Amino acid sequence: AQLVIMTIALSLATFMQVLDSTIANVAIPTIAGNLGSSLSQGTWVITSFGVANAISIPLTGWLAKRVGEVKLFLWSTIAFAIASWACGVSSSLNMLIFFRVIQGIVAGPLIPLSQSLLLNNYPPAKRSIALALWSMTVIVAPICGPILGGYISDNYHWGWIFFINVPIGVAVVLMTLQTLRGRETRTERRRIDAVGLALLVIGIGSLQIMLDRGKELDWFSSQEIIILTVVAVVAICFLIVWELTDDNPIVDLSLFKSRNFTIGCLCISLAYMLYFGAIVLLPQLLQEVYGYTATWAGLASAPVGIIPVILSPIIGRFAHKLDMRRLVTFSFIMYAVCFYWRAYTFEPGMDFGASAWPQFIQGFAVACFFMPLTTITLSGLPPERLAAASSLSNFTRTLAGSIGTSITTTMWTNRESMHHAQLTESVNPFNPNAQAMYSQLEGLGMTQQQASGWIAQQITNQGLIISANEIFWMSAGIFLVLLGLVWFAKPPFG
Amino acid sequence: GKRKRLLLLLTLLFIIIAVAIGIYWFLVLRHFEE
Amino acid sequence: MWVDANFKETQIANMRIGQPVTITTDIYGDDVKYTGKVVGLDMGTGSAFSLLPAQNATGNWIKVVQRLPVRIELDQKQLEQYPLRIGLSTLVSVNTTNRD
Amino acid sequence: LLPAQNATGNWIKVVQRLPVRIELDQKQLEQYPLRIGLSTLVSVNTTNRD
Amino acid sequence: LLPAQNATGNWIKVVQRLPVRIELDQKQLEQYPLRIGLSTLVSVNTTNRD
Amino acid sequence: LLPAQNATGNWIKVVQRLPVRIELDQKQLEQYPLRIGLSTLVSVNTTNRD
Amino acid sequence: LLPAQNATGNWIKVVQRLPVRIELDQKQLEQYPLRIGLSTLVSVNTTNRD
Amino acid sequence: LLPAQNATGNWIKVVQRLPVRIELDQKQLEQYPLRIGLSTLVSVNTTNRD
């Protein structure tokens, strides 16, 4: 059948972007080293893509209304394949940044355009099934990425991270051409608004730069961050004020007039903020405070996909007899349970299983959060506008993810510093079981200064674990309050 | 259009207020290393 | 045995010597109370005599509210019947109404 | 050297532990030798509290 | 008491700090005693540069 | 060597491991030498409880 | 201070750094003094390779 | 300095690395001096196993 092949193709189209997003952050250390640059210098390889993608995502609908959805999809896929190949064969950090910028600008129309095509092409008899299948690919790729990324980083020369996308793009283009022939989309020509584009570029770029660079510059203690935040806020304020008054919609804000859309967008954005701000810490915690490797660290998040890979069809099959709101509430409760589980069970000598059961539990929470909330988000809208709504949803979700990461990292480091301060106090003279430690250390031949450094390192590790567990507790508590918001949405679902 | 004229008008007031606050805070920090 | 109550700098003020105190422990729960008095406050915050930097040199500096220990002396007729052990947690409350 | 404590600013409370010492019947022990550091599961009666 | 090692590749720039000594007046210390380690907010009037 | 430093306030049960000293046939080491610290995989035949 | 261990297994490649010694003109330091630990920016003209 | 302690109950397998010594032609070091701790890329030929 053509439907199944099309489903596979669009799943791959939305899978490649997530794979590329997740793999680079894992591979950044070795890539930075091989090109004679530092971690701060190399981390620009991620911020550039972030800014480019952030700009590209909101603009999907404008190009959709003119170029044509199918043509845009095909052209974007081929261009992304070419850009990934170019990045893979780079030979300098600057050239890598350039090609990453191009790749990010190109890749914007993948996820929302793919979702819109899948939603429209499938007959309404199986809309729920199509949406259920789509949510899987966004829930499995983030874990399918880091394992392979680590294996490639530690075994073969980098560049094969950006080569795997070439065959995926080739298969996607071949299948799309062979399956979507004749299912064209109506177009329309309209005037171009310049102030809107300029205001969007400046504001969103400034916001992304501020979020991605705030940490190293100690946020508001650097004038650069201050000017960036000022320009961002001013651009967004004036830009938003304009769009509601603009005749030609560079961004279609009329969708916010629907109560369901507002509530769904807010809920998904905030829940995603919490999720993505939480999961980011675990890899770093394992690699730095426990000695894990990248491949082992990624392997600790495998048990999340065990549950969704099963329940996703079952939820899709039975969607006819469920009040989706109750699924959202259950998922929020399940996310609180998992984070409280992590909070009261992390210990310096915890085995691999101590950080694998909680993700097995989180599988349920992730499984029943994307499909229902996205079904509510796009409820009752006409078939033609599904593209713009998807673009808005994705833009908000990505913003939430970036914000969550930015807040969580700073909180982690600062609370680690506080705990370090509160701990190093006990290490003084006038204290038994403190000179004994020095005696045992000097027994092994360490100097006095080396022993002091070793004690300081141990205090640092303990502080990181305590600070990391303080963040999980806060996240779960915050979840407990976000529970009830999903009930404000009316039931026109369909 | 007119709504657009008041969109630029309200924005200008905030900007002027911020500029005026910038001098006070300037003088405050300039006269004291804290 | 005595109790070392760590109060923040915000609370250290208004505490004098001899003020009444009430201490409740966890092993015995709320079924048993203790009476005591302030012996005095320490002329140091613990970080005074530390042998290592309070924070890392590489990292930035973050403000942390300090704590200052206080010596509290228990009544000895209650210990003999409800004895304690070193390092047990306890909730302390100091009456600061009277300030000589 | 690094005592976990309810330092001011901590969001999660902690409960201390106090080791108590048990004694084993040696006739059983000689039959099934044990070794230092092995884990177990102890259930102490409290019906009589003279 | 523990040196910072800047030649390690994994180096992130950070603004440095320099200690400065400030002489308090003893007459008001008797009225309001201070302990070692307390925290204060300071302010230096640099209007005169001579 | 050094005590497992005091935990952060949580404690979770984990399985313990106990070393076993396994001899080797010297006549085969000379053909295929080993070195200190090389990982391996042993399998103890335990069908003769005695 | 603490020797680097590179034969570990969790090893990753990072750029190394090599300190270089720079002299200064003392007359300039006469009127704008420096202190140990202050950060700086350095620019070396390598156009003369001999 | 501290031999990594296995049998800790939180053990995960990681590859082990064994250092190998290489003598560098001394007639070419004088033309291109090297420093302690400078990273390099090593290629060792293995066709002649005798």
From Swiss-Prot, chain A:
Signal peptide: none annotated. Disulfide bonds: none annotated. It is found in: Cell inner membrane. Belongs to the major facilitator superfamily. EmrB family. Part of the tripartite efflux system EmrAB-TolC, which is composed of an inner membrane transporter, EmrB, a periplasmic membrane fusion protein, EmrA, and an outer membrane component, TolC. The complex forms a large protein conduit and can translocate molecules across both the inner and outer membranes. Interacts with EmrA. EmrAB complex forms a dimer in vitro. One of its GO terms (cellular component) is plasma membrane. The keyword Kinase does not apply. One of its GO terms (biological process) is response to toxic substance. Residues 30-42, 92-100, 151-155, 215-224, 287-296, 347-354, 420-472 are extracellular. PROSITE patterns: MFS. This is Multidrug export protein EmrB.
From Swiss-Prot, chain B:
Belongs to the membrane fusion protein (MFP) (TC 8.A.1) family. It is found in: Cell inner membrane. Part of the tripartite efflux system EmrAB-TolC, which confers resistance to antibiotics such as CCCP, FCCP, 2,4-dinitrophenol and nalidixic acid. EmrA is a drug-binding protein that provides a physical link between EmrB and TolC. The chain crosses the membrane at residues 8-28. It comes from the Bacteria. This is Multidrug export protein EmrA. Homodimer and homotrimer. Part of the tripartite efflux system EmrAB-TolC, which is composed of an inner membrane transporter, EmrB, a periplasmic membrane fusion protein, EmrA, and an outer membrane component, TolC. The complex forms a large protein conduit and can translocate molecules across both the inner and outer membranes. Interacts with EmrB. EmrAB complex forms a dimer in vitro.
